[PDB]
């Protein structure tokens, strides 16, 4: 009883010293750069396997998109094409608001209307963001495929597979993607503008809070009003209620024990965002990006993460 108490402290002390031990060993202080694409072997040994991020330069110039993709170009090329647009009152789709996890209001708008809202020629309630992931580029904007590649060759050879998804990203400067993780090896390419990433290694998990949230979706009405409507067709989704920009260190003090990485990834640059890595995404106004999702390898590293996630829960560490 008094010994069960001291053992729990020994369990927590191990969990609380793990992120500092793991990051001293595996995680670099700053995000390193590659001047040109790595070899498939180098890419796997140096980055994929040890779960390390890096920005890769000079790997997107065989894409015509780098020279062509202006806001005017999208209008002239795919303006009349209708795409899925996220609409949110504040620019935070897929985020914790109050005691709800809130999903964006989805909209079928022409690209030209989206461009108008960004350019000032038109106005819209809330904030817009073309951010339907699940492979929106080949699905909704296939005409743009002729300006890019359908995959990243050297990485497809390295990971030994083809991308599960190729996504299109076009957003307002006020459109922000909150802290989360995916089970994908992510190669993030920006064609115009610039993306600002706040990264956390998966080993920082014991200092990053999760909770179970009743899910809901913004409903945009004719009066330009967003109302949070409960979706009673899905069990709670776990999400991070922490804003890394302005952390609530009174309620999540242990987040100060975690350390974030920062990197601005620019036009013609490619970021290797490793699987299970936490990221928080900001963008310049009218930023255009394309990312490739390769499904992660479900090996010991994944099983390990599941354990220590469960352990973080059982010890009430957050
Ligand atoms: O650019 C964003 O807003 C988020 C994109 C993202 O998180 C991803 O790499 O899948
Ligand atoms: Ni993501």
264 burial (CB, 10 Å; 0-12 / 13-18 / 19+) is middle
State CA 95 to chain mean position distance.
Answer: 12
Residue with tokens 């890019």: 148
Rounded distance from Cα 264 to ligand 2 centre (Å): 16
Name 67's Cβ contacts closer than 8 Å, sequence gap at least 6.
Answer: none
Atom of ligand 1 nearest to the CA of 177: 3
User: Pocket of ligand 1, candidates 244, 281, 289: which has the most ligand atoms within 8 Å of its Cβ, to mutate?
Assistant: 281
The technique is X-ray
Residue ID of nearest Cα to ligand 1 atom 1 = 281
Rounded distance from Cα 136 to ligand 1 centre (Å): 13
Residue 113 among known ligand-binding residues: no
Give domain limits for the chain: 1-318
Rounded distance from Cα 122 to ligand 1 centre (Å): 26
Rounded distance from Cα 12 to ligand 1 centre (Å): 32
Task: Name the token pair of 239.
Answer: 């999400």
3-state secondary structure the chain: CCHHHHHHHHHHHHHHHHHHHHHHHCCCCCCCEECCCCCHHHHHHHHHCCCCCEEEECCCCCCCHHHHCCHHHHHHHHCCCEEEEEEECCCCCCEEECCEEEECEEEEEEHHHHHHHHHCCCCCCCEEEECCCCCHHHHHCHHHHHHCCCCCHHHHHHHCCCCCEEEEEEECCCCCEEEECCCEEEEEEEEECCEEEEEECHHHHHHCCCEEEEEEEEEECCCCCEEEEECCCCCCEEECCCCCCCCCCCCCHHHHHCCCEEEEECCCEEEEECCCCEEEEEECCCEEEEEEEEECCCCHHHHHHHHHHHHHHHCCCC
Q: Is 291's C-beta closer than 6 angstroms to any atom of ligand 1? A: yes
Class of domain 1-318: mainly beta
For residue 204, the tally of other CB atoms under 10 A from its CB is 23
Instruction: Give residues whose Cβ lies within 5 Å of ion ligand 2.
Output: 182
Residue 124 among known ligand-binding residues: no
Distances (CA, A) of 81 to 135, 266, 267: 16, 27, 25
């Amino acid at each position: 009883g008094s010994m069960a108490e001291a053992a729990l402290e020994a369990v927590r002390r191990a969990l609380q010293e793990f992120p500092a031990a793991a990051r001293d060993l595996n995680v670099p202080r700053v995000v390193p750069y590659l001047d040109e694409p790595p070899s498939p072997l180098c890419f796997y040994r140096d980055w994929v396997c040890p779960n390390r991020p890096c920005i890769i330069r000079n790997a997107l110039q065989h894409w015509p998109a780098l020279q062509k993709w202006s806001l005017s170009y999208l209008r002239a090329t795919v303006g009349s094409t209708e795409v899925s647009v996220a609409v949110t009152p504040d620019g935070y789709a897929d985020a914790v608001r109050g005691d709800r996890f809130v999903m964006p209001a989805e909209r079928r708008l022409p690209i030209s209307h989206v461009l108008d809202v960004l350019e000032g020629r038109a106005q819209h309630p809330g904030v817009l963001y073309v951010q339907k992931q699940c492979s929106n580029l080949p699905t909704e904007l296939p005409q743009l495929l002729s300006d890019i590649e359908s995959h990243v060759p050297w990485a497809s050879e390295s990971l030994g597979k083809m991308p599960d998804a190729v996504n299109f990203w076009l957003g307002d400067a006020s459109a922000v993607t909150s802290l989360h993780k995916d089970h994908y090896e992510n190669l993030y390419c920006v064609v115009s503008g610039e993306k600002h990433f706040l990264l956390h290694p998966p080993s920082d998990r014991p200092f990053i809070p999760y909770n179970l949230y009743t899910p809901a979706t913004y409903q945009l009405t004719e009066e330009g009003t967003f109302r949070v409507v409960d979706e009673e067709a899905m069990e709670k989704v776990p999400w991070i209620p922490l804003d890394p920009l302005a952390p609530d260190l009174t309620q999540y003090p242990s987040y100060s024990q975690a350390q974030a990485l920062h990197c601005t990834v620019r036009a013609g640059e490619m970021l290797y965002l490793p699987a299970l890595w936490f990221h928080h995404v900001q963008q310049s106004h009218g930023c255009i990006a394309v990312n490739f999702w390769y499904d992660m390898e479900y090996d010991l590293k994944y099983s390990y993460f599941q354990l220590m996630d469960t352990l973080t829960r059982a010890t009430g560490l957050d």
